[PDB]
Design an enzyme around this catalytic site. Structure first.
Site, mmCIF file in Angstrom:
data_model
loop_
_atom_site.group_PDB
_atom_site.id
_atom_site.type_symbol
_atom_site.label_atom_id
_atom_site.label_comp_id
_atom_site.label_asym_id
_atom_site.label_seq_id
_atom_site.Cartn_x
_atom_site.Cartn_y
_atom_site.Cartn_z
ATOM 1 N N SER A 79 0.785 -1.226 0.000
ATOM 2 C CA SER A 79 0.000 0.000 0.000
ATOM 3 C C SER A 79 0.815 1.273 0.000
ATOM 4 C CB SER A 79 -0.943 0.008 1.201
ATOM 5 O OG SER A 79 -1.934 -0.975 1.015
ATOM 6 N N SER B 82 -5.991 3.244 3.978
ATOM 7 C CA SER B 82 -5.473 2.193 3.127
ATOM 8 C C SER B 82 -6.593 1.420 2.458
ATOM 9 C CB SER B 82 -4.575 1.227 3.894
ATOM 10 O OG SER B 82 -3.455 0.920 3.080
ATOM 11 N N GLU C 146 -5.290 -3.556 -7.074
ATOM 12 C CA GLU C 146 -5.624 -4.232 -5.821
ATOM 13 C C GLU C 146 -6.620 -5.360 -6.073
ATOM 14 O OE1 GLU C 146 -3.480 -1.737 -3.022
ATOM 15 O OE2 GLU C 146 -4.262 -3.794 -3.081
ATOM 16 N N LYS D 25 0.078 3.654 -2.791
ATOM 17 C CA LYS D 25 -1.093 4.533 -2.852
ATOM 18 C C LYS D 25 -0.690 5.992 -2.907
ATOM 19 C CE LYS D 25 -3.988 0.964 -0.944
ATOM 20 N NZ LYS D 25 -4.641 0.266 0.162
#
Length: 259
Positions: free
Chosen positions: A43, A103, A139, A46
């Protein structure tokens, strides 16, 4: 180094592979440990997706208010915010904040799709002078973190330099940079990672990541008390597929390199 020895000892004690990059903007010095090896970002990627949307908003002012539908078909493995909004819409600003602060993996996928997929996020990184970053997958599969797999990886050095550009440099416009820093300072997921290895009075904006093979990551911009800011990237991965996350290792690295 003495710091190198201590990071090596921590890595050995921990049983995994540790990658560390600290940039001290006071004197432009660096502390590097395995800083050119690739680690699965999980993550922590991101931040680049949100940054790519923020860059887009510099030429499309109304972009962050654009509404995106959230459907059941969008849910993936971890959707703490998006699941509250199924059958409704979220703005791109809301999605960015969800990705960065909680997240949320739906939020990430919506950011990826908006800018045109993983290759577009990667192309944005290239535009910033980062030729190491690569986002390959969406994802949730980008978190597999298989050893030897270059997909969805970067190096500690590249990510620290890029994070410096995004949060302390001029990669983004004034308003967009401030928004990114504000989101990262509001992160809810990082208190046990880098932050746990720093004094309570220091201010941290960070993005954590975790994934397969006990991959445990955190990237941070740090404002110490009465000092110039720091950039710290701590990447950690382990040999066993089902290894548990080790946020303590990132806190320990943070303490070692900021002592």
């Amino acid at each position: 180094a003495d710091v190198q020895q201590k990071l090596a000892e921590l890595e050995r004690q921990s049983g995994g592979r540790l990658g560390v990059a600290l940039i001290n903007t006071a004197d432009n010095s660096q502390i590097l440990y395995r800083a050119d090896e690739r680690f699965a970002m999980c993550s922590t990627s991101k931040v680049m997706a949100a940054a790519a949307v923020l860059k887009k908003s510099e030429s499309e002012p109304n972009l962050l208010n654009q509404r995106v539908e959230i459907k059941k078909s969008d849910l993936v493995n971890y959707n703490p915010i998006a699941e509250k909004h199924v059958n409704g819409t979220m703005s791109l600003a809301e999605l960015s904040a969800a990705a960065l602060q909680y997240s949320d993996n739906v939020a990430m996928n919506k950011l990826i799709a908006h800018v045109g997929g993983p290759a577009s996020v990667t192309a944005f990184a290239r535009q910033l002078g980062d030729e190491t970053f690569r986002l390959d997958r969406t994802e949730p599969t980008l978190n597999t973190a298989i050893p030897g797999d270059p997909r969805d990886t970067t190096s500690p050095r590249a990510m620290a330099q890029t994070l410096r550009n995004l949060t302390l440099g001029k990669a983004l416009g004034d308003s967009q940079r401030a928004q990114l820093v504000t989101w990262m300072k509001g992160n809810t997921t990082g208190a046990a990672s880098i932050q746990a290895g720093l004094p309570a009075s220091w201010v941290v904006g960070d993005k954590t990541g975790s994934g397969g093979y006990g991959t445990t990551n955190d990237i941070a911009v740090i404002w110490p008390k009465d000092r110039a800011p720091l950039i710290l990237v701590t990447y950690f991965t382990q040999p066993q597929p089902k290894a548990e996350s080790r946020r303590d290792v990132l806190a320990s690295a943070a303490k070692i390199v900021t002592d």
